[PDB]
Amino acid sequence: VSHQQGQSHLFECDYPISADTYVINWYKDGTSVMNYLSGGEPAFTEDLDDRTDVQFVNNRNLEITNLRVSDEGEYYCSVIEIGAGGQSGDGTRYQLVVFVPPTITLMGGPYEVEVGEMMMSTCRANSHPPSNFTWTLPNGNVTQGAVLEITNMTQAEIGTYMCTADNGYGTDYESVDITM
Amino acid sequence: VSHQQGQSHLFECDYPISADTYVINWYKDGTSVMNYLSGGEPAFTEDLDDRTDVQFVNNRNLEITNLRVSDEGEYYCSVIEIGAGGQSGDGTRYQLVVFVPPTITLMGGPYEVEVGEMMMSTCRANSHPPSNFTWTLPNGNVTQGAVLEITNMTQAEIGTYMCTADNGYGTDYESVDITM
């Protein structure tokens, strides 16, 4: 399940609780990030320690109201019923994705090139997951990879070059002219 | 055509230029934001003045590489051919949308309410365009509007309440418990 940064997500503890007294834990990648004893107060731990944007709702469910990329991971609750006939088990496991669409920045040059000289340009992008890159040359040809390289500048190489960055959660492009 | 903030957009001047000497202007909502004389240098004006993230590519096209919400508007180029038989005309008009998905923040209370007393909660969201809001009550009933209001707290009103914000370009929600 995916969201962008700053958005909320609520994980449901869907284990059938039937005891008057019980303990709930929420786990992130196998480590407890919240513990709760029925009738008490939820205590948030580890990655969720010192976060003001976390909530325990309906005495069951975990909510993070200001998602960060670092919040990504697998979440599930474990329930322990206290007293006679008391059972224990886990809720459904959820995989949280917090994505950031690509925004490109370009590093390199020169973009004005002497005949017979060279240039290099590295396309980069702020994103999550990390993006895949291509360069599109003035002739439409698509090159795979973040690095654009011209080794022997000719009248044939002058034109508009376009980087594209795509991480499955959005796309960005940026065009620059290479001239003599 | 839509993008998120920080992404690029390139507007094409698709007027058929056939003169050796010509002038190109780019307009935003009817006001010139760039002028260019063939063989000279592009000069960016008005809203595009003092922006380092603007480019004039292929002696034709306008590019903004760090989009802001304020960049929204209608864009088109106008071409003036200089000399004998010289013509003039406009390129295609484009409508640029720069959206921000909703991120909710909640304002109000109390969320612990005395019997017979009242509470109010106002759901808000950072977004563009501005979002439409609903509250979902513990009984599933969906109320339209950003404001949640409880006037006579009863055992019947306790439970989880959920605001949803949606602006056509994404959705966010946030759940809070109202108890006695």
From TrEMBL, chains A, B:
Main location: membrane
Keywords: Disulfide bond, Glycoprotein, Immunoglobulin domain, Membrane, Signal, Transmembrane, Transmembrane helix
GO CC annotation, single: membrane
Membrane disposition: Single-pass type I membrane protein
Disulphide linkage map: 13-77, 123-163
Keyword Transport annotated: no
Domain Ig-like span(s) in chain numbering: 1-79, 102-179
Compartments where found: Membrane
Protein name: V-set and immunoglobulin domain-containing protein 10-like isoform X2
Species annotation: Branchiostoma floridae
